[PDB]
Amino acid sequence: VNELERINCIPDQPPTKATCDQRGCCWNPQGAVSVPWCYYSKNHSYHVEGNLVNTNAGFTARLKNLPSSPVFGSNVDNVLLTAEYQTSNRFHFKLTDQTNNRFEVPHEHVQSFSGNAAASLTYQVEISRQPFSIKVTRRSNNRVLFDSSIGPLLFADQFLQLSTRLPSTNVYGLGEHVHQQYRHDMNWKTWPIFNRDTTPNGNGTNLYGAQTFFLCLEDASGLSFGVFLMNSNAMEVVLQPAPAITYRTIGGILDFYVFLGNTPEQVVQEYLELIGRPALPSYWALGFHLSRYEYGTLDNMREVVERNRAAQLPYDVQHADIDYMDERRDFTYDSVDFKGFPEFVNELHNNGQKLVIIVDPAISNNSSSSKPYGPYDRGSDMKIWVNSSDGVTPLIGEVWPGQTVFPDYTNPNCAVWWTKEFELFHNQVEFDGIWIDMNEVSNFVDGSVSGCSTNNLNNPPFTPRILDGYLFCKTLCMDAVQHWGKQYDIHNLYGYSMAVATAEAAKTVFPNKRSFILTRSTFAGSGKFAAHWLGDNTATWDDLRWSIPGVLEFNLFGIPMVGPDICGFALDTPEELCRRWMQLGAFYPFSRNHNGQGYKDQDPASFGADSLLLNSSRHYLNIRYTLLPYLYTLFFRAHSRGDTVARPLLHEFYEDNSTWDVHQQFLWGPGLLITPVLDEGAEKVMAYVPDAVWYDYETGSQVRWRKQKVEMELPGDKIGLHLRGGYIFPTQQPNTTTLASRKNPLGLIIALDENKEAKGELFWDDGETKDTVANKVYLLCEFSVTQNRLEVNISQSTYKDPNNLAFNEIKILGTEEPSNVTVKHNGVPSTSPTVTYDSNLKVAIITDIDLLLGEAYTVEWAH
């Protein structure tokens, strides 16, 4: 037994031969660091009893427990395996207790499979019976993708474990954590997953959300696969250099999906087809957002808003944190410090901006006839609180307002209550979107104001290595009771259920609009409802660097609108760090500068009306806004097809092994390469330039670099931005708000490849109506350039923007001088446009043209 393949039999304590012998495992203390001294033997677990049975969907097998001493308690004697060949690219298998119903995640999107095994499978499944293992191989090359035979199946009531070999070390995903790098360290690493309010720092703890998905790039051909575990109990995932991964959970069932794709993008698409593709955001949510904890007063907030508006900062959204509230209570505002809040909301709206308000789940229980607190009275009337273990008394904890009860968003009636609270509050403050926070759920006491009873839920036989080592730390008692079940089973689902309930509330408060929901805690599928931010980071260079893997991983998870707090939540931010973070932050799919309580101001204009930081911030935000039609179309593809938005280099450049661990650069979609300076004092960045033609975004000059590491010169006012040859990028003249920018002239940037060809697309709808994609009210056009000729081709034409939008500029990169430029409309000539040519840079710009959005054109030229 090769030491890299040993599966640890003593995860719970310092390894001893005595414990090893008792557990019937193998003892060998002579390995390298982290190699398990005690590891499972060749036959520990389950065997198949009798024959497999064909079903319409796949097959079932009965697994029988081989005799073994009970380590983490009540072992499951008869296990049922149910396997379903759900699609050509997705396999589903579950291990359940044959004679008892167990908790299964009540997911809102995923449904039970009815139907027949798919035809033309890209995979094969192989079951070994003595001892049990399950293998999933790729049919084309027989590559073993999933293979549980490396370790036992373990299945006790509060301890379930299965391992899989992996075909490579290119492993990406799992969450929510700060991994620091994007490609996984496979060198004996354990990642705990249990929704927790904790600082995203260098300690590798469980954080706000629970994401069990990972993607593996098998080799340079691009062939990739993914694995998702549908389980919401506390768990940890163990990575080792075999390479192999082990999932270790403390309840529910092992419900696994395996996805195959021809590229990393296709694996993500397969995962999202299962779990739910992300919502198409409101176009305004793609703009820049500004926020802080404790402006203190509306006057102070209003002063910040005004100096950034005075600076002409692209600036769509203002967030109001708990300081707007009357003593930190939801659905109120402070009538003294925030007197005139409704007038301020009108000011934002008149300026073409949006208000996003924070709402916390926990509700103050302080109410009397003397001073009623409406949300609590109404919630108690409807009996929609999380209860203590007696099943009848609302659990009391403590959050921002003091003592609180917690809504049980798993109860359908709770969404009715929540909806009414928002309707009532929206009648006072006409906010545009909702930021749901502290929804792990976060509790300032451990469990409840009276602690937690000692029992198998609060104190289980095995505890994954979660921060502080107790499940109820800074959250609710594990024996608290909700509609879907006990907190032990549904804790990781709280913020998911809250986001589902908040989207329901939006149906009434914002009829037929998308609005915007931003959530802290997530589960698999949360992106269908909400954006995410990476939580309470710190103003350090480490946090700046660590942000990029976090953004890429949430894109894998189908929450593409993701970003950190730009400049750093905790601590005063250094000018240089904030300047670099604003440059990079202009390109986070969710772009928000947010700051903690009491720290020095870090809004862009606070650095000086004429400062390098403000100038550069404005410059790069103006570039972001210019590329919004491109970014929005990327979101359209995430929503409709399941593509990533912020995308790892390796998803486009998988043939090139130098991209497999790149985490200091990323792409927008296939075509825009972003190269930030991430090191203090630096005016350079060591960067990778992939195997494509690349053009400097601002000058349009073709770089000489290709497929190579470079030292990119990036002075204090620059971030690297390069356009990929072969792509056509739709643009729109920027303005300080997207309300205004969407009325502006459009442009095309044609970045020619080595063959002088390029292709692109543009999605365009009204930017805010819900279901425009499902109801087919949108424009989708395709651009292609193949020598001497641009074609604009319309594939869907069921929305026509009333603002007379047209492409009034075409910039062609990598071209010899165009002559005789001719424009045809539906094949019919043809006015001569203006052409400007830079012969040193090989850039042509065509102007004095008006190609109406939604019409077919051909633009032809000679050389």
Ligand X SMILES: *[C@@H]1O[C@H](CO)[C@@H](O)[C@H](O)[C@H]1NC(C)=O
Ligand Y SMILES: *[C@@H]1O[C@H](CO)[C@@H](O[C@@H]2O[C@H](CO)[C@@H](O)[C@H](O)[C@H]2NC(C)=O)[C@H](O)[C@H]1NC(C)=O
Note the residues at the interface with ligand NR3 (CB under 6 A).
197, 293, 321-322, 358, 437, 442, 536, 596-597
Residue 247 host element (H or E): strand 244-249
Query: Where is the binding site for acarbose, in residues?
Result: 197, 321, 520, 536, 594
Beta strands in 429-519 (DSSP E): 433-436, 481-482, 485-486, 517-519
Query: What is the DSSP code (8-state) at residue 119?
Result: S
CB-wise, 164 or 731, nearer to ligand X?
Answer: 731
Q: Which residue has the tokens 């280099």?
A: 649
- To ligand NR3, the closest distance from the beta carbon of 166 in angstroms equals 35
> At a CB cut-off of 8 Å and minimum separation 6, what does 50 contact?
62
Residue 826, both tokens? 């539906």
Query: Which residue number, 526 or 626, has a Cβ lying nearer to ligand X?
Result: 626
Q: Is 391 in the site for ligand Y (CB under 6 A)?
A: yes
Q: Which residue among the candidates 440, 479, 504, 543 is catalytic per the annotation?
A: 440
Quote the Cα angle for 309-314-316, to 5°.
85
- Both tokens of residue 654? 């998988």
Question: Tokens 């080592």 correspond to what residue?
Answer: 469
437 tagged catalytic: yes
**Residue appearing with tokens 């995923």:** 110
Q: Does 440 participate in catalysis according to the annotation?
A: yes
Closest distance to ligand X from the beta carbon of 680 (Å): 37
Other CB atoms closer than 10 Å to residue 840's CB: what's the count? 6
Residue facing ligand X at closest CB distance: 740
When CB distances are held under 5 to 8 angstroms depending on the partner's kind, the choice from ligand NR3, ligand Y, ligand X, none that residue 249 binds is none
Of 358 and 692, the one with the shorter C-beta distance to ligand NR3 is: 358
For ligand X, the closer of residues 459 and 744 by Cβ is 744
Q: Gaps (C–N > 2.5 Å) in the chain: which residues precede them?
A: 830
Select the binding partner of residue 387 from ligand Y, ligand X, ligand NR3, none (C-beta < 5 to 8 A, by kind): ligand Y
Out of 64, 189, 383, 743, the residue judged to bind ligand Y by CB under 6 A: 383
Given ligand Y, ligand X, ligand NR3, none, residue 391, with its beta carbon under 5 to 8 Å by kind, binds ligand Y
Of 48 and 481, which has the nearer Cβ to ligand Y? 481
Element (H, E) at 47: strand 46-54
Least CB distance to ligand NR3 at residue 292 (A): 7
CB of 442 to ligand NR3, least distance (A): 6
State the minimum distance, in angstroms, from the CB of residue 565 to ligand NR3.
7
Distances, alpha carbon 97 to alpha carbons 75, 155, 156, 216, 266, in Å:
10, 9, 9, 30, 33
Burial class (CB in 10 A: 0-12, 13-18, 19+), 575: middle
Q: Which of 470, 524, 479, 526 is nearest to 500 (CA)?
A: 526
- Which residue of the set 323, 334, 437, 661 is catalytic? 437
The partner in contact with residue 392, picked from ligand NR3, ligand Y, ligand X, none with C-beta cut-offs of 5 to 8 angstroms by kind, is ligand Y
Shorter beta-carbon distance to ligand NR3: residue 538 or 772: 538
**DSSP label at residue 658:** G
The CB-of-735 to ligand X minimum distance in angstroms stands at 4
Yes or no: say if 256 and 228 are a contact pair by the CB < 8 Å rule: yes
By a kind-dependent CB cut-off of 5 to 8 A, residue 740 interacts, out of ligand Y, ligand NR3, ligand X, none, with ligand X
Secondary structure of residue 556 in the 3-state scheme:
helix
What is the token pair recorded at 252?
Answer: 């529910």
Looking at beta carbons only, is 16 or 735 nearer to ligand X? 735
List all residues 6 or more positions away from 365 whose beta carbon is below 8 Å from its beta carbon: 376, 394, 396, 403, 404, 405
C-alpha triplet 381, 386, 388: angle, nearest 5°: 110
**Dist. CA 861–CA 822, nearest whole Å:** 6
Q: Are 407 and 384 in contact (CB under 8 A)?
A: yes
Toward ligand Y, which CB reaches closer, 321 or 408? 408
Asked if 138 and 260 count as a contact pair (C-beta separation under 8 A), the reply is yes
Q: Which is nearer to ligand NR3, 471 or 845 (CB)?
A: 471
Picked from ligand X, ligand Y, ligand NR3, none, the partner binding residue 75 (CB below 5 to 8 A depending on kind) is none
Q: Which of 809, 818, 812 is nearest to 750 (CA)?
A: 812
User: Least distance to ligand Y from the beta carbon of 390, Å?
Assistant: 9
Q: Give 733's strand partners.
A: none
Q: Determine the Cα angle at 616 with ends 615 and 617, to 5°.
A: 95
Where do we find the tokens 């925030």? 338
Nearest to 672, CA basis, from 691, 694, 701: 694
Which one-letter DSSP state was computed for residue 491? G
Interface size with ligand Y, residues (CB under 6 A): 8
Shortest Å, Cβ 304 to ligand NR3: 15
Residues that bind ligand X (CB under 6 A): 352, 733, 735-736, 740, 743-744
Give residue for tokens 């087809």: 273
Is residue 294 a contact partner of residue 323, using CB atoms and an 8 Å limit?
yes
Residue 500 CB, shortest distance to ligand NR3, in Å, is 21
Q: Which does 272 bind (CB under 5 to 8 A by kind): ligand Y, ligand NR3, ligand X, none?
A: none
Does 800 interact with ligand Y (rule: CB under 6 A)? no
769 DSSP β-pair partners: 513
**Residue 358 near which of ligand X, ligand Y, ligand NR3, none (CB within 5-8 Å, type-dependent):** ligand NR3
Query: Looking at beta carbons only, is 375 or 730 nearer to ligand NR3?
Result: 375
Judged by CB, which is closer to ligand X: 366, or 744?
744
Under the binding rule (CB under 6 A), the answer on residue 412 touching ligand Y is no
Interface with ligand Y in residues 8-37 (CB under 6 A): none
β-pairing, 235-240 vs 843-847, is unpaired
Minimum CB separation of residue 745 from ligand X in Å reads: 8
Q: Which does 437 bind (CB under 5 to 8 A by kind): ligand Y, ligand NR3, ligand X, none?
A: ligand NR3
Picked from ligand X, ligand Y, ligand NR3, none, the partner binding residue 321 (CB below 5 to 8 A depending on kind) is ligand NR3
Is 387 a binding residue for ligand Y by CB under 6 A? The answer is yes
Cβ 285 to ligand X, closest distance in Å?
18
Q: Following DSSP, what letter does each residue of 377-430 receive, concatenated?
A: HHHHHHT-BPB-TTSSSBP-EEETTEEEE-B-TTSHHHHHHHHHHHHHHHTTS-
Residue ranges for the known binding site are 197, 321, 520, 536, 594
**Residue 735 binds which one of ligand X, ligand Y, ligand NR3, none, with CB within 5 to 8 A depending on kind?**
ligand X
Q: At residue 819, what are phi and psi to the nearest 5 degrees?
A: -130, 165
Burial class (CB in 10 A: 0-12, 13-18, 19+), 826: exposed
392 binds ligand Y (CB under 6 A): yes
Instruction: Name residues contacting ligand Y, limited to 442-501 (CB under 6 A).
Output: 481-483
Chain positions contacting ligand Y, by CB under 6 A: 383, 387, 391-392, 408, 481-483
Positions marked catalytic: 437, 440
